[PDB]
Design an enzyme around this catalytic site. Structure first.
Site, PDB file in Angstrom:
ATOM      1  N   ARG A   1     -12.078  20.352   7.847  1.00  0.00           N
ATOM      2  CA  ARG A   1     -11.027  20.642   9.008  1.00  0.00           C
ATOM      3  C   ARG A   1     -11.539  21.980   9.645  1.00  0.00           C
ATOM      4  O   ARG A   1     -11.954  22.834   9.129  1.00  0.00           O
ATOM      5  CB  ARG A   1      -9.582  20.819   8.473  1.00  0.00           C
ATOM      6  CG  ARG A   1      -8.811  19.456   7.994  1.00  0.00           C
ATOM      7  CD  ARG A   1      -7.604  19.421   7.813  1.00  0.00           C
ATOM      8  NE  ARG A   1      -6.839  18.345   7.554  1.00  0.00           N
ATOM      9  CZ  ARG A   1      -6.378  17.371   8.551  1.00  0.00           C
ATOM     10  NH1 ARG A   1      -6.643  17.890   9.956  1.00  0.00           N
ATOM     11  NH2 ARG A   1      -5.856  16.178   8.202  1.00  0.00           N
TER      12      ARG A   1
ATOM     13  N   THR B   1      -9.265  -1.544   8.750  1.00  0.00           N
ATOM     14  CA  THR B   1      -8.935  -1.393  10.269  1.00  0.00           C
ATOM     15  C   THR B   1      -7.480  -1.638  11.034  1.00  0.00           C
ATOM     16  O   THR B   1      -7.174  -2.817  10.690  1.00  0.00           O
ATOM     17  CB  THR B   1     -10.297  -1.801  11.182  1.00  0.00           C
ATOM     18  OG1 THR B   1      -9.736  -2.014  12.674  1.00  0.00           O
ATOM     19  CG2 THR B   1     -10.953  -3.048  10.521  1.00  0.00           C
TER      20      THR B   1
ATOM     21  N   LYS C   1     -13.478   3.334  -0.672  1.00  0.00           N
ATOM     22  CA  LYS C   1     -13.579   3.006   0.882  1.00  0.00           C
ATOM     23  C   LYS C   1     -14.647   3.761   1.262  1.00  0.00           C
ATOM     24  O   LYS C   1     -14.854   4.914   1.010  1.00  0.00           O
ATOM     25  CB  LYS C   1     -12.340   4.013   1.404  1.00  0.00           C
ATOM     26  CG  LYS C   1     -10.959   3.304   1.036  1.00  0.00           C
ATOM     27  CD  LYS C   1      -9.808   4.297   1.032  1.00  0.00           C
ATOM     28  CE  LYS C   1      -9.160   4.566   2.543  1.00  0.00           C
ATOM     29  NZ  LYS C   1      -7.946   5.400   2.411  1.00  0.00           N
TER      30      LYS C   1
ATOM     31  N   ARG D   1       0.830  -1.254   0.005  1.00  0.00           N
ATOM     32  CA  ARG D   1       0.040  -0.119  -0.142  1.00  0.00           C
ATOM     33  C   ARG D   1       0.888   1.285  -0.162  1.00  0.00           C
ATOM     34  O   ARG D   1       1.579   1.492   0.998  1.00  0.00           O
ATOM     35  CB  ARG D   1      -0.765   0.142   1.390  1.00  0.00           C
ATOM     36  CG  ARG D   1      -1.672   1.300   1.445  1.00  0.00           C
ATOM     37  CD  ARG D   1      -2.784   1.166   2.430  1.00  0.00           C
ATOM     38  NE  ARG D   1      -3.545   2.264   2.610  1.00  0.00           N
ATOM     39  CZ  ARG D   1      -3.290   3.213   3.826  1.00  0.00           C
ATOM     40  NH1 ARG D   1      -2.405   2.946   4.595  1.00  0.00           N
ATOM     41  NH2 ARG D   1      -4.190   4.264   3.943  1.00  0.00           N
TER      42      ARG D   1
END
Lengths: 384, 487, 500, 386
Positions: free
Chosen positions: C99, C303, C245, C57
């Site tokens: 944010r 996870t 995702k 990854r």
């Protein structure tokens, strides 16, 4: 269809084929309808048929007069007086002209079943229900099918009727004669209505003491097809060997019943029956399932209308079904269903305790489990 | 046992009862026909082929080698006329028999005695030793005698039931008949007809043990190695030792009349149901030899009871049905096969093939070979994709036998280069055979077969077909299952 | 769901609990390792291969193209040292972010009762009563009653009023937060581009020319996001697989449509359960893994389950059973994040990962797995029926391997969907196929040459299987080949071979 | 199952679960401590879903015991469990606790370090005829306990598992296996099993657990545990919200169970021949599924009848009706069983339970209910709620 499986047939033992099985002739699950006649005239001949496994008495009204049929009906009552534990059922075969033989002859004498001839629609069975009225509300209506239009409306006829009677000779291309027999028996089995196979299976018994090998096969196939009842015509009415004919019938039935894969038969039933089953019917299923699981000897069904016993009979348990009823009309009508032996009662432990003592006397044995069912819905399991 | 389910029988449509239609040879159940004067014509034999004949039975109880040779050649002329059909050749033996003596009750071993109703002679010289104070049947089971006293050359009986003729048949319930299975005539029939003429099956009469079959296998030897031995179970000893007989045999033949001799009359269907199921489970072929259409001898149409008798035999799970007097010495031989085929087809539409397969799988012995595992795959996959055809490439017939054992709903197309194999696989139901030139390859043979199958309308454009090739019975080979679209 | 049955769990032998020695690359569940400084060297990369790494990854949330280019070559060097291992390459996109702004004292202490204003002026120096938000469309994307999570869900805020240029909230819990912290908006579709120009630069100028096999797309909210990425990849990126995702409620709501367009799914508990109530997080995971299993689409459990192994050489007991249950849920892959990227014990983390995977895999009832798949999947193609036959016969004869000859990967995917108990050996000439099938559990690949017939290639694959201890003399093997793979009407072949 | 989990709804994930917390199937064991002290918080623990109180100064436990019964009288029967110290099979401190405290007062006794089937007999001897009603639940803390588990389980009333204990001697990768092994073994035997593993320890200092801890309890429920346990959480800054969350997770995991599969898996794996009473218990469960009954009502004296029905894990709630306080408080270790104490002196008993079930939201008017009673002879009654 309701017969032996690949595994059930391959497990047929040498003892079943070589040595004659010794069991009470009336312990048979398949029931026998005998056409009463001049050979049955004697009261000694009628009691002999009862000991040879007679369950239903047929009175063919297509020949003879009412005064001669009254003599038979009175005679069979005297024959049933001799044997108190056993009880018979009376059926009348029809030929407008038979309307006087239905409204007057069947109502007064107190017949249980009406074999109405040449029914073609679901409207027809309403006419024979209306003519009977409130006085004839307890008499069951059984359509005989001889006509092609009747087969086309068979589902609509089955739904209103109290069971159907089928004969091979009446149905007649010759190639597709067995199809009708198998289609109808199976459709009755799924619906829970009792089926009588009227076809003369043993025409050799009229003159000869033992039947042909092919005739034996024919009878066995009908039992394994899933019929509730079988019929003797000329064998009992005008034959040289009437007693030996019924004795041979019960022998074949008992032998054919030993091949049945009851576990498969139950599964086949459960898989095919309509999705929504009532609460009462669910308890009836449990009774059969539990009977198989603990290998019980009896299922005692306490019923008044004969409905609860008719629910147990639909799922065809391996053990005997003992129907207990106060109504004498109930205990005579349930003879149309196979595997059903009924006892008349008076008015929980009240009738069940007496049933266990009566079944032990008619040996059921000590140390056996028994399933009791009463319909609001109850199911008891007691040791013998 | 191999018949209809609750649902199958309930789903019988009015189109089955009322309307009729399909080709006669597309049936699954195969027909054996006893040959005689009625069908002796080259023309009439061809007519039976089109009506649904699969195996020709040559009954060697009557006729000479010359009579049967002409009958053999006449059938070969019909084979020349019908190139697609390829028929099996069955030779039924006369076998051992016990006969009564002459007449101008005690039973003496002296067969020269012309006796009265007080004393009659018997052919079986070892009767005193074999029978103990047991029943003795005479005149095709018409007269019954109970043995009460036994001696050195005498047997004393009491007549339990008529007037019988001379030199009549005898049967002995619950005792092993100590007479050879291959008589000097049978020995001649096998060595001088069966082998040189190229017969496929030998229906051995009165097989009592597995030794009897072995005795016949040793007689056949290398020259008759490709001839199948089909024992006829006829007595109580045959029932008792059935399992071991079956394992050594190549197939089983049963007539209800012969089994119904030594067994109580009510128990005839038991012996039938037991043996057909066990033959199914072993994947061994079974022939119901029972005469089930005897009226067709004098009548154009059969009895209603005769029809359902044939139908139930099919639903019992039999591979073959047989016509005896109907084809041999009957007024209506062509009509007999035609009605037989029709009854088979309508009965076959009642079979629940899924339940049949499931009950077979559950009951067959726990461990199976890789070859059989692929055979199950082929059948399971065929049912899953509703294939029209399972093509079986086989040299010995083994691969075809494995598929047949699991009774698929679709026709099995067996392909072989061996003439014997193609003729032999006729005993198994749902199997049709095509002779092929020696295997050039897997792709080549399969492709050519589909062409032959398309020309016979067995498949259609767009249908899926399953091909299986095994090397064969030898362990550790390579097994192919090929799925092809016929388009 | 794809785990131990009543019988299987009661059949756990004493040997399984007490006696430890099988090859780690023999496992079925595959491992995604996040690359970083802790595994930059060729020697470490090789050790991770031996430990059971299957996918590498690349996290493009930080790092230059040059840094990742150097990383990509070092794994390529590792590959040359381990030719029995063909590694998949995954690129992780940055995606949309929301944010908080900067703070007057770099830190503020938010309190329960207090009312907080969130402004859209990202240049506003915030305090305890007023903080800026980077999502300009906030006031129009939010209504009274919505929840706003600040700093990875540490602080929850309930919306009281919305206006043109700000929102007014009440802090549901008290906490102290820092500058520039992540925000989430439960039940709100965040209207931001799924890929920015930077994400676009990463895909076209790294993923494509470097030859990555997978793109894990952050914050997918609809099937349109997946379609937008496929268009960008174009004809040049045709063989690159898109792995969404699911990181918010919208992605959960539209999950089905997303899965259909997807080539696979990647879920991480921390992000997927961010907008989900704490007690319901496991529900989303079981639903999506089951749905992927049923569809044949691969799923990646992302996870971080071995977090403590950043510092410790051994995980906590809770961490182990958490991994075990992930495998038993039916995940195709597990992922290591900080353990491999910036941890003290990267080789050790992969080593126990494989070991837990081997342990939990020994518990699975495969017969139950197969049945409940077939019972839940209604009409199927001939190719899929043959795939079923292959899996069933493999169970029947207890084959060591299902050999799947496959150019695109279709045939191998079909078999993998039915989750056989034995390894699937996929053979392909295509380099992308071989490196792509890595996301499916129980599939291992050999690159093959130009074969004119099935005979030669199967026989060569068996000799390699013998060499690699995947099969032994006497074992049965099932070979499957579909001439025209996803095209109806071709010839499908199932072949059983005994190894000599 | 594949189907059950793929049928998990958006409602299940996004909307809060508004079932009553005491209507859950998985029962909670709470260890008592300083945080539980007050009678007020202890009632609030009951409402949160407490079923069994764990006791872990002798007079200090007596303070809690009396305050628990005061809370119980204020509100529903609670099981009482005593946990031994252990390490020399039975400790002197343990023998003094069993005889002078556990026998004198509690329904369950959790024995420490059991390594054979003779140890449980030894503890049963020490209990004597006075300790006939007390259930013995051995804690497995070593290898030998796992070696002779089959012999230990057969003699014991139930089993208590801690992951920290069994995984002390076991290899790291192996720890999860022992939990799944023993839970299934218990399930197949009908013996209740408590998972004592502290799985929400973060709730000691925080009002919410970590997401990791959530799936851990979720998987314990799905492994097939009868009970879950809170240790430091109840004995912690947030004891009430720890039980509340523990209950909610249980309800959320229970909604995923494929009950038809569970029953089928059970039946296929149990020892071939079964007693007549157990077959009647099977039917009661099968009939409850076929007509979607709201309740199985078990009239039981010893609890044995309710234990048979509990073994076969029906989807609906099991109501156990008993005249004994001992059994009503003993059936708490079993999953999905809520107990009612009835008068010592059947038709009225069944009618009474249905009325309480209406008030407890367990059943509605028009619903079917299955009643089962075994004298030894054995009865099954199906009644519609009027």
């Amino acid at each position: 269809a309701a017969g032996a499986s690949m595994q059930s047939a391959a497990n047929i033992t040498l003892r079943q084929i070589l040595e004659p099985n010794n069991v009470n002739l009336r312990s048979k699950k398949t029931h026998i309808v005998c056409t009463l006649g001049p050979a049955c005239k004697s009261v000694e001949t009628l009691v002999k048929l009862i000991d040879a496994g007679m369950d239903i008495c047929r009175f063919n009204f297509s020949h003879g007069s009412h005064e001669d049929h009254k003599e038979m009906f009175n005679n069979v009552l005297k024959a049933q007086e001799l044997r108190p534990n056993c009880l018979l059922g009376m059926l009348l075969d029809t030929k407008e002209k038979d309307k006087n033989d239905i409204l007057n002859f069947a109502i007064p004498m107190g017949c249980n079943f009406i074999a109405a001839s040449f029914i073609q629609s679901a409207d027809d069975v309403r006419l024979i229900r209306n003519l009977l009225g409130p006085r004839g509300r307890h008499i069951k209506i059984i359509p005989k099918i001889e006509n092609i239009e009747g087969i086309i409306h068979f589902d609509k006829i089955l739904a209103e009727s109290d069971g159907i009677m089928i004969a091979r000779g009446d149905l007649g291309s010759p190639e597709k004669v067995f199809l009708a027999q198998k289609l109808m028996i199976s459709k009755c089995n799924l619906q829970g209505k009792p089926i009588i196979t009227a076809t003369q299976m043993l025409e050799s018994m009229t003159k000869n003491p033992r039947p042909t090998r092919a005739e034996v096969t024919d009878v066995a196939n009908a039992v394994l097809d899933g019929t509730d009842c079988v019929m003797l015509s000329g064998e009992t009415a005008g034959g040289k060997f009437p007693v030996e004919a019924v004795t041979i019938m019960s022998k074949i039935c008992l032998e054919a019943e030993a091949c049945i894969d009851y576990k498969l038969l139950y599964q086949s039933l459960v898989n095919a029956i309509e999705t929504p089953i009532s609460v009462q019917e669910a308890v009836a299923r449990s009774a059969v399932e539990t009977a198989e699981s603990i290998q019980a000897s009896l299922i005692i069904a306490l019923t008044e209308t004969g409905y609860t016993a008719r629910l147990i009979a639909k799922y065809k348990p391996s053990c005997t079904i003992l129907a207990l009823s106060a109504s004498d009309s109930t205990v005579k009508c349930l003879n149309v269903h196979r595997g059903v032996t009924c006892i008349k009662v008076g008015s929980t432990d009240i009738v069940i305790r007496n049933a266990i003592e009566i079944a032990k006397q008619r040996n059921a044995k000590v140390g056996d489990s028994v399933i009791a069912i009463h319909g609001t819905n109850l199911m008891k399991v007691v040791q013998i």
